[PDB]
Amino acid sequence: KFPRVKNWEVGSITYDTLSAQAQQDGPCTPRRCLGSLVFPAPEQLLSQARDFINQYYSSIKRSGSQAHEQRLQEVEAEVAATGTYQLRESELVFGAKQAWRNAPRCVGRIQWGKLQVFDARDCRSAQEMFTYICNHIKYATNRGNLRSAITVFPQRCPGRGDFRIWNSQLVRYAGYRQQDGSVRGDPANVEITELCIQHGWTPGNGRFDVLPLLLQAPDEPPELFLLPPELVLEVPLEHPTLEWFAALGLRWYALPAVSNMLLEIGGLEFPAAPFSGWYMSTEIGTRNLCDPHRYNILEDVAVCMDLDTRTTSSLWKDKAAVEINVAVLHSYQLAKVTIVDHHAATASFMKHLENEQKARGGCPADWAWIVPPISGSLTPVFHQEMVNYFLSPAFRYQPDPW
Amino acid sequence: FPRVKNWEVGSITYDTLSAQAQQDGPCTPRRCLGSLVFPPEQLLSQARDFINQYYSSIKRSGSQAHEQRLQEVEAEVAATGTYQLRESELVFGAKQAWRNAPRCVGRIQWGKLQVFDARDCRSAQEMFTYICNHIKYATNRGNLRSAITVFPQRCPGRGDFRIWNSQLVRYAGYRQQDGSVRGDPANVEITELCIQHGWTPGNGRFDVLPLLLQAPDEPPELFLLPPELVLEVPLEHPTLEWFAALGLRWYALPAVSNMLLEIGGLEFPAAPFSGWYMSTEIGTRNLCDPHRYNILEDVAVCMDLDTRTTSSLWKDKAAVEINVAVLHSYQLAKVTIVDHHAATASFMKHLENEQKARGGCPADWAWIVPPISGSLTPVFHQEMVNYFLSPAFRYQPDPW
Ligand code: HEM
Ligand code: HEM
Ligand SMILES: Cc1cc(CCc2cc(CCN(C)C)cc(F)c2F)nc(N)n1
Ligand SMILES: Cc1cc(CCc2cc(CCN(C)C)cc(F)c2F)nc(N)n1
Ligand SMILES: C[C@H](O)[C@H](O)[C@H]1CNc2nc(N)[nH]c(=O)c2N1
Ligand SMILES: C[C@H](O)[C@H](O)[C@H]1CNc2nc(N)[nH]c(=O)c2N1
Ligand SMILES: [Cl-]
Ligand SMILES: [Cl-]
Ligand SMILES: [Gd]
Ligand SMILES: [Gd]
Ligand SMILES: [Zn+2]
Numbered sequence: 021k022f023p024r025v026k027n028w029e030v031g032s033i034t035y036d037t038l039s040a041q042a043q044q045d046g047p048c049t050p051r052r053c054l055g056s057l058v059f060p061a062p063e064q065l066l067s068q069a070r071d072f073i074n075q076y077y078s079s080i081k082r083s084g085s086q087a088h089e090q091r092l093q094e095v096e097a098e099v100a101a102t103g104t105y106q107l108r109e110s111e112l113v114f115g116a117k118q119a120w121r122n123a124p125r126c127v128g129r130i131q132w133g134k135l136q137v138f139d140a141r142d143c144r145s146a147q148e149m150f151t152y153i154c155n156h157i158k159y160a161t162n163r164g165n166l167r168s169a170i171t172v173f174p175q176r177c178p179g180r181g182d183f184r185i186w187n188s189q190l191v192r193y194a195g196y197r198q199q200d201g202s203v204r205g206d207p208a209n210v211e212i213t214e215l216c217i218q219h220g221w222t223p224g225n226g227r228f229d230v231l232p233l234l235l236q237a238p239d240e241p242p243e244l245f246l247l248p249p250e251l252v253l254e255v256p257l258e259h260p261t262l263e264w265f266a267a268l269g270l271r272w273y274a275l276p277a278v279s280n281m282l283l284e285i286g287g288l289e290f291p292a293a294p295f296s297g298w299y300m301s302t303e304i305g306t307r308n309l310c311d312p313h314r315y316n317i318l319e320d321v322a323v324c325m326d327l328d329t330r331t332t333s334s335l336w337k338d339k340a341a342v343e344i345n346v347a348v349l350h351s352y353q354l355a356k357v358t359i360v361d362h363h364a365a366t367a368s369f370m371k372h373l374e375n376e377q378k379a380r381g382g383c384p385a386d387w388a389w390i391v392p393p394i395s396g397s398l399t400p401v402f403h404q405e406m407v408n409y410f411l412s413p414a415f416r417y418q419p420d421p422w
Numbered sequence: 423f424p425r426v427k428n429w430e431v432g433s434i435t436y437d438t439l440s441a442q443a444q445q446d447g448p449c450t451p452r453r454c455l456g457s458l459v460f461p462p463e464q465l466l467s468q469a470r471d472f473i474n475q476y477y478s479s480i481k482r483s484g485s486q487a488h489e490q491r492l493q494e495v496e497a498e499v500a501a502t503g504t505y506q507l508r509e510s511e512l513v514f515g516a517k518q519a520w521r522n523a524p525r526c527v528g529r530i531q532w533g534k535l536q537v538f539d540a541r542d543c544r545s546a547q548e549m550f551t552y553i554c555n556h557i558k559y560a561t562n563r564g565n566l567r568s569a570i571t572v573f574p575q576r577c578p579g580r581g582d583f584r585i586w587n588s589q590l591v592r593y594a595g596y597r598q599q600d601g602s603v604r605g606d607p608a609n610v611e612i613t614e615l616c617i618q619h620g621w622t623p624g625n626g627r628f629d630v631l632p633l634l635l636q637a638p639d640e641p642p643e644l645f646l647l648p649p650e651l652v653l654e655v656p657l658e659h660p661t662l663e664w665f666a667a668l669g670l671r672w673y674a675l676p677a678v679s680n681m682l683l684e685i686g687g688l689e690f691p692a693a694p695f696s697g698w699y700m701s702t703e704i705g706t707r708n709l710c711d712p713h714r715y716n717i718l719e720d721v722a723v724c725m726d727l728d729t730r731t732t733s734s735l736w737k738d739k740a741a742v743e744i745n746v747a748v749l750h751s752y753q754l755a756k757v758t759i760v761d762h763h764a765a766t767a768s769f770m771k772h773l774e775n776e777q778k779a780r781g782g783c784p785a786d787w788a789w790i791v792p793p794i795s796g797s798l799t800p801v802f803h804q805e806m807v808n809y810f811l812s813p814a815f816r817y818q819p820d821p822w
């Protein structure tokens with residue numbers, strides 16, 4: 021009835037009873053697994069809300085109390101009267117933490133309870149929106165001692181359009197399509213860069229130009245905002261023992277702040293709720309810098325290293341990527357900016373898995389996203405079978421507003 | 423029809439072949455178990471479909487011998503219960519089951535498989551000389567060749583041909599006065615049985631285990647593999663002269679001897695297949711897995727790396743040099759080896775071939791992506807669809 025899950029490093033076995041409670045449905049069938057795919061009404065508002073309030077009163081040990089049944093009636097009454105309902109502040113804080121706790125592709129979830137929730141549900145315009153965001157960046161960055169934070173903007177509601185942040189992260193480097201089809205800067209941000217220029221951003225011509233924010237208030241076009249330079253903490257990349265490395269002129273930013281996901285809590289939808297943590301070195305070193313469709317620096321580094329790039333069996337790619345990652349950790353530690361390496365990160369995820377197994381009887385985890393993109397079987401999560409399922413509250417992908 | 427994207431290039435394909443999925447898998451709309459290692463008249467229906475495959479692949483759908491072959495297996499099963507395959511069908515099916523193995527990154531080679539027919543086998547001594555012919559043929563003085571030896575299929579009331587080893591070459595696993603193992607911890611148990619059935623234990627980390635072979639309704643009988651038949655490669659590193667002194671070794675022939683070949687409803691519990699190694703199989707899993715030889719820290723001490731902080735990436739640095747040694751040692755030994763970059767690149771080519779041929783390919787992302795440098799290889803950026811087609815290799819209960 022419940023999936024049996026083996027740990028092959030230790031021999032451990034557990035059963036994931038929490039999987040049985042999966043509130044929504046994923047893309048696999050008994051026919052065919054699609055696990056590897058990146059992108060897989062009053063009645064049903066009431067049931068989602070009822071489940072969430074039940075979770076909330078579970079977490080405060082008031083299950084089935086007077087206050088519990090009063091809240092249930094309050095929400096039903098409000099759904100009948102208005103078609104929606106409003107979260108209390110403590111419910112919002114709990115729901116945003118749960119959403120992080122439930123995110124299956126997050127290796128950083130050992131921290132889920134230490135999340136700083138900024139309530140911006142009273143936000144009114146794109147301008148007030150930008151101020152809230154600047155303060156989030158400032159709080160989360162914290163001069164290099166990064167802190168996990170989420171800012172929750174007003175919920176989707178009938179009659180009004182959504183608050184949206186068009187940028188996928190608060191800090192992104194421009195991607196300038198040049199005349200042939202070769203991108204200068206970050207190729208993943210080609211589209212959002214064009215939108216910025218089309219909305220009157222004066223573009224630069226560097227590889228590391230920070231993009232402006234395109235911020236959409238309800239039923240308004242998007243509005244462009246420049247992030248103050250001294251709010252965007254950045255890290256020039258150098259290598260502890262390859263001194264030509266600094267002449268590559270590579271940089272990355274301190275704050276990974278995902279800004280295009282929808283936060284769902286008890287049926288309510290928050291299309292704008294940017295959250296930020298701190299980086300794992302392989303996101304920057306392996307993925308952002310070596311992905312053939314991103315900065316794609318791997319061969320240029322290998323050539324500088326005097327590796328033989330004419331045969332693959334010399335493993336020049338593995339050697340060059342390892343040093344790129346070394347350079348990222350060293351550089352961040354030098355700059356005194358929070359960073360975790362994939363070994364530290366995957367070991368603490370194992371502790372998370374053990375905490376969650378005791379607390380809820382399992383843990384949604386997407387193995388292919390939890391296993392780092394280099395040195396996979398050298399980390400303990402590689403040898404841990406995982407069960408992937410969708411719990412709510414949740415962060416979800418949503419279509420781009422344009 | 424699943425939409426499948428390659429993120430490196432941005433290309434889209436559709437897996438239309440998924441629609442024909444046979445033995446349903448472990449996943450449901452509510453939970454994905456993709457990461458788990460281990461998830462009679464119906465014989466006619468599976469026999470029918472395999473024959474239909476066979477004649478479609480030789481441009482002979484619905485012509486003469488196809489219709490006729492349908493009636494014979496009708497008659498054979500009608501009279502006796504089971505049925506025998508034509509020798510080419512055994513060959514065509516041994517190859518399709520390779521072509522269908524979603525966890526095999528080496529499937530670009532599927533069409534060049536050598537099938538040794540051993541269906542007329544009768545006992546542990548006969549097996550042993552079949553296996554031995556396979557080993558020496560496949561090894562071929564280090565110029566390795568894909569081979570499968572197929573032993574007699576299964577029918578009720580009588581026993582089963584089985585190889586009690588998971589592979590033909592395995593290293594010993596000796597427990598100690600304190601639990602910890604000298605040798606290979608993944609074999610420890612099959613070492614217990616070999617010692618139990620008369621074998622004299624060595625004292626080494628790389629003692630090649632005997633070969634517990636069993637014929638229907640008969641207890642296993644040990645067989646000592648001839649030392650000249652077991653091609654092995656001492657591991658040395660091209661620039662680290664002390665690596666040789668670590669005294670590490672691996673064997674040349676990866677020969678899987680415990681899986682159940684299944685063609686047209688027929689079950690061959692003994693059908694050992696062999697190919698050649700990918701270097702990460704040896705260097706990364708076999709030697710560096712924490713429950714295998716677990717040499718990673720010992721190699722890092724020799725490289726003077728800072729094992730005190732994980733952020734030195736000492737594990738990654740030592741793993742790459744272990745893999746380099748493996749590739750260098752096999753090449754110096756003139757023994758077929760393929761690195762994970764070359765292998766994954768061929769798999770991409772195989773996906774494109776299988777797309778235009780069969781309209782898709784069953785692929786298990788977690789096992790196709792190599793255990794080091796995953797995202798440096800193109801398979802990482804390739805979405806994949808996993809499903810079960812027949813003919814197929816299957817896992818099966820351990821014999822004992
Ligand atoms: C503080 C340390 C954190 C670490 C080390 C971390 C790590 C990661 C990593 C490596 C991924 C895979 C990303 C990729 O390769 O694209 C990921 C995904 C994700 N993270 Fe975390 N994260 C952290 C904080 C947070 C916070 C604070 C939240 C929300 C409150 C969060 C929510 C998510 C979500 C929803 C995903 C899935 C998004 C996706 O990749 O599709 N993370 N995380
Ligand atoms: C010729 C080059 C070959 C290469 C480089 C290769 C490599 C691999 C690798 C790396 C795996 C990963 C699974 C694991 O390590 O547990 C695998 C799995 C598998 N291969 Fe291949 N292999 C080759 C030939 C063959 C042949 C000849 C057959 C059968 C005719 C075959 C059938 C399979 C099967 C059934 C699996 C899945 C078994 C399992 O994962 O438990 N392969 N192969
Ligand atoms: C708060 C936070 C989030 C993340 C994940 C960042 C993230 C990055 C991408 C880009 C694609 N990826 C291959 C690089 C897509 C995503 F959906 C995504 F959430 N990480 C860390 N440390 N903190
Ligand atoms: C013919 C062939 C097969 C293989 C795969 C080897 C293989 C390995 C395991 C577990 C051990 N693994 C985690 C280290 C289980 C299997 F069923 C299995 F077939 N490889 C290569 N090159 N050729
Ligand atoms: C196709 C494949 O599933 C896809 O590229 C996935 C694989 N694993 C990943 N893992 C992480 N952390 N981030 C990713 O973008 C991906 N991409
Ligand atoms: C839990 C995880 O699915 C499991 O460790 C798998 C992942 N990929 C693997 N790949 C290979 N080749 N061999 C393995 O044992 C595994 N183990
Ligand atoms: Cl990122
Ligand atoms: Cl192996
Ligand atoms: Gd230097
Ligand atoms: Gd020394
Ligand atoms: Zn699945």
